[PDB]
Structure formats: structure tokens, C-alpha cells
Symmetry: D2
Amino acid sequence: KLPNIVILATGGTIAGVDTLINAVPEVKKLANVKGEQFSNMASENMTGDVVLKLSQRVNELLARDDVDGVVITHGTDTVEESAYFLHLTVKSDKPVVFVAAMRPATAISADGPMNLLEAVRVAGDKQSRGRGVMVVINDRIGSARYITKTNASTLDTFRANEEGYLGVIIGNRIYYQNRIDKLHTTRSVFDVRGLTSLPKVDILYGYQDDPEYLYDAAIQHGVKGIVYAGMGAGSVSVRGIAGMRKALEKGVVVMRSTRTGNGIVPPDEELPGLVSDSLNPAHARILLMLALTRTSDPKVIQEYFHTY
Amino acid sequence: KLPNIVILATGGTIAGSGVDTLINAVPEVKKLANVKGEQFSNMASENMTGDVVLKLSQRVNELLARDDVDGVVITHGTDTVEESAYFLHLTVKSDKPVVFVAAMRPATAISADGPMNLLEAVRVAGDKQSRGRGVMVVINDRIGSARYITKTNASTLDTFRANEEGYLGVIIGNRIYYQNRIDKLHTTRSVFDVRGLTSLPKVDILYGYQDDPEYLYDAAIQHGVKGIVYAGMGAGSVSVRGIAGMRKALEKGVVVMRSTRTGNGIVPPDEELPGLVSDSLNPAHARILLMLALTRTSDPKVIQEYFHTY
Amino acid sequence: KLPNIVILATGGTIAGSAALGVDTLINAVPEVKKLANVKGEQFSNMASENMTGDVVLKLSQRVNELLARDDVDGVVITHGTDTVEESAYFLHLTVKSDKPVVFVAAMRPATAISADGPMNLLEAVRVAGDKQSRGRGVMVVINDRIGSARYITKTNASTLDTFRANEEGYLGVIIGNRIYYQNRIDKLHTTRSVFDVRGLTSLPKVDILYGYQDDPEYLYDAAIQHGVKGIVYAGMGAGSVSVRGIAGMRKALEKGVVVMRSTRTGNGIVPPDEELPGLVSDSLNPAHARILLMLALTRTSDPKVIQEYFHTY
Amino acid sequence: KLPNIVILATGGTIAGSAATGTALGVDTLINAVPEVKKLANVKGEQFSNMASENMTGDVVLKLSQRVNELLARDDVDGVVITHGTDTVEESAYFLHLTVKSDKPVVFVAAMRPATAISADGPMNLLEAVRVAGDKQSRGRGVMVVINDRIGSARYITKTNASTLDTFRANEEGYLGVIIGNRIYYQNRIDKLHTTRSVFDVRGLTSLPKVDILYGYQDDPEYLYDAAIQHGVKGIVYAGMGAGSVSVRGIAGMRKALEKGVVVMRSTRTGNGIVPPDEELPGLVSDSLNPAHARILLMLALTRTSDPKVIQEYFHTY
Ligand SMILES: N[C@@H](CC(=O)O)C(=O)O
Ligand SMILES: N[C@@H](CC(=O)O)C(=O)O
Ligand SMILES: N[C@@H](CC(=O)O)C(=O)O
Ligand SMILES: N[C@@H](CC(=O)O)C(=O)O
């Protein structure tokens, strides 16, 4: 009866992998679980080269006939970045479910145990296939493309204000609500098998008195892309625009996102750079880095931003 | 009979295709108040700068000192209204209403929001019950505190929200409904005296994200910044590279303030990390309070206390 | 060639003044004529609080007929905000077409300063005429948002941004004259729905009873005595029932009335609980639950079949 | 000196015990969070032990009188009330109107039973005790503390059937939050409550009867008749939109008013303002939801049946 699920641990407040498994032995009634310790770091230290390797490992795991799904334990701070990277790069319809905890395993009313039990339920459910990469936490199933950590510190921090959840887990039952209307996983062009490094992309904030010199510094340190976390709908001050023009003059791809938290940065013929659609800055950086593995053609990169 | 309101125009999409053109388009405002328009500036708010917001604050302070001004409405772009409004929230030494207003659609647009926004803002500014509430941002039938309200969406009419703090009030059916008073210091109780000042200590904002680079901290230090606000991962969590950058800044006397990129909530104290914490201030609000904090002191404990009280 | 869109008007504040015919709404936003070849048809002209099942049934049947024509590519239905979620979910279950069906409404009357209706209607016509809008289920378009009829609800008495689906989000948004589609609903609707209402002229009676401290058994008695076929309970919490409500429900079940337990809370799942009477409404709110229950009772009174509809529609 | 906090237990899922991790007395709640001893000197008192869907006005009245008695004592600094989540908003708003003290009254609840994996009640209870015992918490009105949030009784509502984060005040936010063992107070409510409320229920043992009727397509007039015949003193209408009323509902309302029943138009929508409309029967609920509006109406009817006086209470409380 039971699905074969690998729990691949990377670190996080949620935390070895076998302690997490033995600490929530109820997972063993939902799936035949095998723990693998991939890494053990706080997610604020997760790096692209490690995420690239995580993607390659999960691709290897899901190519096996004896693996039905993977649960990846991770820190909450950057789970949206790791999850979106896998969303673009894992070429399987078998479920990939990131899980995390906002309270440490030792805290009163720690959320990790239930989050993990939910994540294993989701990863093992046959109805979970072909949905894109998911983040499960606090009874919710979020798409990697939409979900984001919206609050510094609360248990219900992961939300997608405009897109909602793919599903919810209540009373030990999964309720699937939406399928994302975007490309991912088995329909994505972002194959990264045997890449070993990724194009450098920095994120610069927009705000009153924002300085041009941060652009100059990024250019000088060899960035290939800049994601702008812009005022409003990717609006730019005279200083930012001077900086973006310098970047473009020097061969950098400029992507205008928003610092607001939500919503669409629309095309604008009268401003430099590309536009991020509804990708926030963290997600935009991940798609831009992957885009630059394939192309430097701004029309092609822009169309990825509208479709992924 | 009527309240005397000054409409001080700074620019923004609310005036997008003069202040008297905005007034003449909403002649209904004249039944709520005796309005006078003044054109302070005309710029998109992405170009608003501290030096200009200083002048704005000084002008509004001057106006509110006058018997013949009951309140001020400030028309502004949406993109950085939260920054301008929080600056005035900290520096305007009057209990008379100061109401920032804006529009997400240009004045020419089908179902443009500016006309009703402006009428609501004039109602709020003239209402006797509006006194002593701190600076306000009025848009889309909502009254937001300058300390909590933020532009949460790039493009929608209902973008201004304070998810955890709610609205001070709402305007429905031509009546104001006051819900909350902010439990923070502001306006007449503020220490932030900016009379005589013409510029402000330099503070930049650096983002937190996977692979964030140390060299941006170096660049900021080299350019003479007095403060760095960090728009951190999670609860102001810092990578190894960020910590290195922050330790370099602290050694050079830069005040480092850890906020969050998430959008909401509390960055709690953590003695094992560098720098101060931003309480519930988002990075744009944190920059504004940190610049004003540095007009009084560089002492980290004093600044941290401002951050827990303003 | 522009899409051919019928604008079917039913009333609402969108046509209110401080009433207006469909051609006036159209002519107040002449931009709609650049997006589509529009034909206005006045179906009704009432406030939506007065919209009734028998009329919604006729609306559905008319829209079904229209969308079977080769010269109609989609329909926009102007309606009051107050019960648009009920009309829209009814059509979502009963219109057997993939062509777009887009309800639109306005929170401010047409005469109001910064009236919302003009942009709402333009957006609605854009949505209805886009080929990418096909096969999505019935939609409610307002305030730059495209809500599924199955999830969207009026969440605020009085604001422009009242239509939200907190847990399910929007199907799409309309920004800068462009449609951004985000989600497809994972539920049955329209061309995959079993709820055929061709030929019908009336629907089984279903009332909604509220749950709250001191809630009285006598409202159950009254509904039962008046011949209701179903009772939707707008329950405390997750369809929780007081001793009085349980007494009332057991009376109803004795008389063959189908009891459906929803929630007054506004959102989320009422889970199965074999210890309590009645069926459970999944994530359907009470207004939506009533619409699905009325239609279910046209086909079955088997509680298991009804329960499965509530988990799949 | 630590504050003296009474934990007054009334039931709820916070005190629930299921078969497995996928009824309880107060001292069991207290003993599962021994950390509470460092925040306060706590004493447990068992007021009731029921599911909150069974809480009744007559018992809520007794609860308020007990809390009033407790807070009059010098040796009581604050009270925490453990309760079911389903009608906590009703009991809390009742006390918010009738507790004549500035000392903290903090309702607390839990969405998962005590036996559940990652049960929320232990931390909810600790946070409620911290809030009740903090000197900064006085004079804030009655509070509901759950999931790191401090909600005013006047605004807070259960918005979701089943999630941990269900308690929200979408338009009014939280009074405060509790993060890292520290309280952050954000707002003071701009409404009358507690020591400034006219609603004294010291002598009473019951309240005027008020029922709630829903608004929806095809809503039936006969439920108005039924209510009137069962002796209601008020009807709260959970109306369509902004308290909009069908022709059937208007006929029902008019019959109610003829019989001296006070009709209060609220909204089913979940949030926002039901504005005055002289063209419609009855009064309007301001931003009070139906459950809150019923509580205020019952208390209003202990003092007056003057619709003007009742309307003004609804704009001020
Ligand atoms: N800093 C932690 C926070 C968490 O997991 O809640 C991490 O991201 O590893
Ligand atoms: N970029 C404009 C946007 C607006 O006002 O909606 C501004 O901030 O001036
Ligand atoms: N009562 C009106 C309100 C609206 O349309 O906004 C209706 O539903 O017809
Ligand atoms: N039905 C329970 C639900 C809860 O406590 O969460 C009660 O309200 O007592």
C-alpha cells in the first residue's frame, strides 16, 4: 500500500534526518520513508551552487522506479528560492515537497512535527502528481512560484496573497483547490544537469535617495544580471535609471521587480530593462540566473518571465 | 462654518495624464472645506528625496502653526508615499491632521480613483475627530497610519494595506469610522526636531537573499553611509557574507539596522547577530527612522529604543 | 475580427444612479467596442438581493442557448454585487460550454465619483473575448481581479476590493490592459458538470440557518414545517452544532430533509465528523453550499452522492 | 513580585483529548506548561467544561459576574479565560462590554486538541498569561490571544473553520503581537469598553432574547414570523452585502417592528460597514458582524428599546 518517500534534509529551524523521522514516527504509517542527509545549514547560508546540486540529486532520486516522491526539509528564510529553483529544474511529475518550521524542534507548540507529517502525506498522495514543486507548512500547500515568506516571525507566514494555495490539509485529508497556470518541471526548458556554477545576479533595492554607486559596484564585480526590487511597479529614480543604463551599456541584463510584495510589474516602453510579471525579487533572481544559463536575448528572457 | 484645508501638491499619478486642476475636477471638496491649493513640487514619487521631504515637513509645520489652517492634504505619488508620510509622522509638531493622498490610476483613466481619494482625504483632514492621530494615508476608502501603511501591490487600487495592524479608520457612505489609535510616539510627542536642517544622514538599504554579496557593504562604507538598513531574509537573518559586511561597517562606525524583506512582522533582538533590529518597521520605514535617529545620536541603544517606540 | 460578446444585463448598482439600461452602460464605456463586437440584451433589472432561483435558472438556460450559437464567443452578465456569488456559482454548475461566462458588477453607482463600473465592465469584456479565457469555469470580474465562481465571495459590506478568495486566490488579474492567468480551479464545472437544468422551471427549496450562542431549535421546526428539502447550516466554527441545533437537525433528517453543515466563519474546510448529524460542505460557504445543494436535490436525495458532489464541485 | 493571574477554565478544544496525536481540567492545562510559573503566580479555577458551541448567554452572564468579582480583589492582577474557539468572539465581546475593570481579561483557545501533534494550546496559554500579567496590558479592553496575536474582542473573529491562524481582524488588525517572549502593542481600540461602558449586568440572570436570520437568494419571510412568535426582543439580520434586504425580508422586518422587536441589519460578508439607509427597515450594525451585533443588541435591550439610543451604541461600542 505505502508510497516510497525519501526525506532529503538540508537544515533549518525544523532541525539529523533520522531524528526528525524517529521524532515523528507517525510518518511511517503514511509512507515507507528513507532519510538522506544532503546538508545541514541555516537557509540564510544556502547558495546557488548547493541548490544546483540539490536539484541534480532530486532529479536522480525521482528517476528511480522505487521512489514515489521527495520531501525536502529546509530553513524557512530562503525556502521560496530553493523551491522555485527546483520548480524550474526538476524534470519529473513525482511530487517534490519542501517543508520547514518557524519554531525550533524544542519549542513549546513546535510546528515542525505536524508540518513534516503533512508534507509526507502530500508527497505520497497520487493526486499530488504534476502540480509543480510545493511548500507545505501550517496546513497549507503553496506553489513554489507563488508562495513567499510574508512575515518575519509568525507560523502563518507563508502566503500567496493574490494566487492562494494549491491546496490545504485538514483533518488528515488533502483538499486540492488550484493548479498553477504556468510552466514547470517536466514542461520546463531549464535543464541544468552537469552545470556546476550559475550566472551571478544581485538584487538592488529601490527607495528615496537610492544611489547610483550600488549599480556601479555590481557592474564592477561582474554581475550578469541585476534584479531591481523597485518602488511601486518597478518605478525608477533618476539615479536608478542612470545605474540601469550603465549596467546595460556594460552587458548586464536588468530585470525590474517590485519591493511591494505582490502583483504585476507591467511592460513599459519608456523605461530600461525587462519586467518581472508577478515574480517578487527573490523568485525573479532565481529565474533570471537560470535564464542566463540558456540565453542573453532579452525577448526570450522576458517571455520566460511571462510563462514560468 | 467649514474647515480650512490646504491641498499641498507634490506630484504623482493623482495629477497624471496642477493642484487647481485637481481641485476643479472634484468641486464637491468645496462643500466639505474651504480649500486652497499650493503647488509644492511636481515630481513622480520615485524621485522624491530626503532634502525635499525635509522642506515639505518644514512647510507643513509652518502651515499648521497658523490659526487659518485646520489641516493639510498632501497629494503625492503612490510609490514612495509611505516614506514621505512616515518622515512627516516623525517631524510634524502638530496635532492637526496631515493627510497624504494618492491615486493608482491616472486622472485620465477610466474609473480613475484620484477624485474620490481626494474627497475622502479632505473629509478626513477637516473632521474634528481626526486630530492627534499621527500622519495618515487615505486612499480606496481606507485611512492608514504612516507608521504601518505600505504599498503592498505593484498595480492594484487596494494596494495600501497594513496586514497585521489594520487601518486607523475607513470612510463609507460619506462618514468616517475610526477603529484604532496607533500606540506609538509621533508628531507632538516626537523628539525629531528638523528645523534648520537642509540634509539628512545618508542611509542605504541592502537586500538579503541567497548568495548575497559582501562587496555591496564595502561599497556603501566607501561612499560614506552613516547607516545601512538590511532587508533581511526572514527575521533579519544574515548569511556568512552579510555578517562579514556588517562587521566591516560596524568597525567603521556605520549603524546597521536589520529589517526584513518579507513584508510584515517583528525582527526580534538577537545578541548573536550584528546590528540593531527594526521591530515591525519595513525596510523603507526603517531607513526613514534611522536617518532621523542619526540626527540625534549614534548611540546604538538610543537608536534601538527609538525603533521600539516610534 | 473582434470577438462577439453578448452583454446580458440583470440589474445591480452597476446600473444604479443617484435603473440604467444595458445600452447606456455600454455607451458609457465606448472602449468596449474596440475589444469586441458587443450586443446588449436586457434580461432583468432588479437589485440582486431580489434575485431568485427561478430567475437564475432562466438566466442559465438563456446563457446556455446563447453560447451554443456559432456567432457568440462569450457572455458578460451585469449583476448586483450582493448575490453575484450565488448566481455565478449556479451558472458555473449548469452552463455546458467552455466559452467564457463573465459576471461583472460595481460597488459604486454609475453616477458616483470614481465609479468602478466602467473599468469593471471593460475588464470583463476583455476577459470574455480572450481565447485564453476558455474552459476556466464561470468568472466574476471586478477591481482588476478574475475570481472563480466556486471560490469568490463578497467579503466586505462596502469596499471596492470586497471580492476575495482568501485561501484560493484569483484565477487571474487584469493589469495594463493585459490578462495574467494564475490558476485553473481543480474542481468540476461547466462542460464536465452533471447538473443539466434544461427544461426546468423550479428548484428544491433550501434554507440557511445561522449558528451562534443560544441558537434556537424552533427555526429548524419552522423550515421543516414549510417543506424545505434541504437545510444549510452556517455553523459555528467547523460546522459545530449546539444541543439545540442537533435536536433540530435530527428532526429534519427524520422528515427526509438533507442537512448540510457549512460555516459562518467565512473560509476553510468543514471536515467530516460521523458523530455529528448531516453532511459537510468542504470549502463551500453557506451561500455557495445552498446553490450546490438545490442542484444536487434535482438529481438525488442519497446523502452519499450529495456528499461526493460537495467534495468535487 | 510576579503578577497574580487566575486561569478561569470554561472548556474548548484547548482542553480536548483525542485517541491519538493525529474534558481536561484546568490544572492539567497549567501542568502541561510549567514555564507559566516564571511569568505569574497562577491559580486555576474551573468555571465550566463545555464545548463553546454550547455556551449560552445565561452562562456568559455568570462568567462576567465572576470575572468582575475576581478583578475587584487586590490579590488578582488579571484573568485568563480558557474557552472553545467557536464562540470565543461572542463571550469575549460580552465581557468587553460588562467587565468594570482595567485589569487584563484575556481569552485564550486552541484549534488543535491538547493531545495533537504540534498542538497550539500550550504556547497560546503561555502567551495569554504573559499578556495578562504585563503592566502594559491594562486598559485595553478584552483580548483574545492565540497564534502569537492579541485581538480586540470588538474586532477579532474566527475567519476560518479549521486553521491555526483563523483569528483575524481583516480591516482593524491586531492590538498587539507576541514574538520572542516580548509583547509588541500596535493599536488601542477607538471604542468604549470595560470601565467606560454603560452596560452593567450585576443584578441580572438572563438577557433579552435575540435571534439571527441569514440573507440569501429566496430567503423566507416565515422565519421572521417564527422568531416573532417565539418572543424575540431583537432580530439581527446577517444580510446580503451592506445589510440589503429582499422584498420577503422587508415584509418580515416590518412585521417584527410592528410587534416591538428591534431589527438590526448586519452583513453575512465577514467585514466592513453597514451604512445607514432610511429607505430600509431597522437599524444598522456599523462594523459589527452578526455574532457581535447580537451580543451588543442583547445588552442594549437591558437598558432601552429606543432605536436612536441603540443605534448610537452601535456606532460607539
Ligand atoms: N534561519 C532559519 C529560520 C527557519 O528555518 O525558521 C533558516 O532559514 O534556516
Ligand atoms: N510612479 C507614480 C505612481 C503613482 O502615483 O501611482 C508615483 O509614485 O509618482
Ligand atoms: N444591492 C445592490 C448592491 C451592488 O450591486 O453593489 C445589488 O446587489 O444589486
Ligand atoms: N468546538 C470547539 C472548537 C475549538 O475549541 O477549537 C469549541 O469551540 O469548544
